[PDB]
Design a protein around this ligand. Structure first.
Ligand SMILES: [Mg+2]
Ligand SMILES: [Mg+2]
Ligand SMILES: [Mg+2]
Ligand SMILES: [Mg+2]
Lengths: 42, 35, 42, 42, 34, 32
């Protein structure tokens, strides 16, 4: 059971990092769309 | 002349790279769960 | 171990809320791209 | 305790699938923004 | 005659994936509650 | 009018901020 709990902790810390990577991808997508708007308005 | 065109490829390319990082990290989480 | 289990549950509930926030951020990004398309066309 | 670990594993597997769906949504949004750029340029 | 911009296929695919994600997060939450 | 999708982009930014706070809270629960 300790090994299983260790495996769950390891998996969740890695899953939280995967989410952080998608969060950062989202930030870059927002910058891309803002760049499209800024181009169109210029 | 490139300034005559729209180029948001730096931001898109950064997003693509981070979605690839996420996929690696999810595959690792799945492998640890399966193990 | 029982403490590690209750802690894992509370962490995963919080992770789930983080993911729901990123999911709604993605909806907002889509709405922005739709707004760009509508402007270009209309 | 055994059933609680099984429950946490089932939830984390499901959470990972949700994240993967959001990651794929992100890939599709990028294709859409690249399509907007290509339209504006060409 | 300029053709219309239409990225709705990719955006509609993204929308559907975010709907799938919502169903899965709700499933995950309900597994925890049980 | 100008193109303005700032309401939706600002909302996306705000939601990603919320996600960051929650991920930091989740990571602290694990730590603690
Ligand atoms: Mg660890
Ligand atoms: Mg579906
Ligand atoms: Mg404004
Ligand atoms: Mg906030």
């Amino acid at each position: 059971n300790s090994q299983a709990i260790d495996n769950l902790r390891a998996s969740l810390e890695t899953t939280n990092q995967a989410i952080e990577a998608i969060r950062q991808a989202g930030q870059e997508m927002i910058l891309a769309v803002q760049g499209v708007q800024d181009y169109i308005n210029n | 002349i490139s300034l005559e065109r729209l180029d948001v490829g730096t931001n898109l390319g950064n997003a693509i790279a981070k979605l690839e990082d996420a996929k690696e990290l999810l595959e690792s989480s799945d492998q640890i769960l399966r193990s």
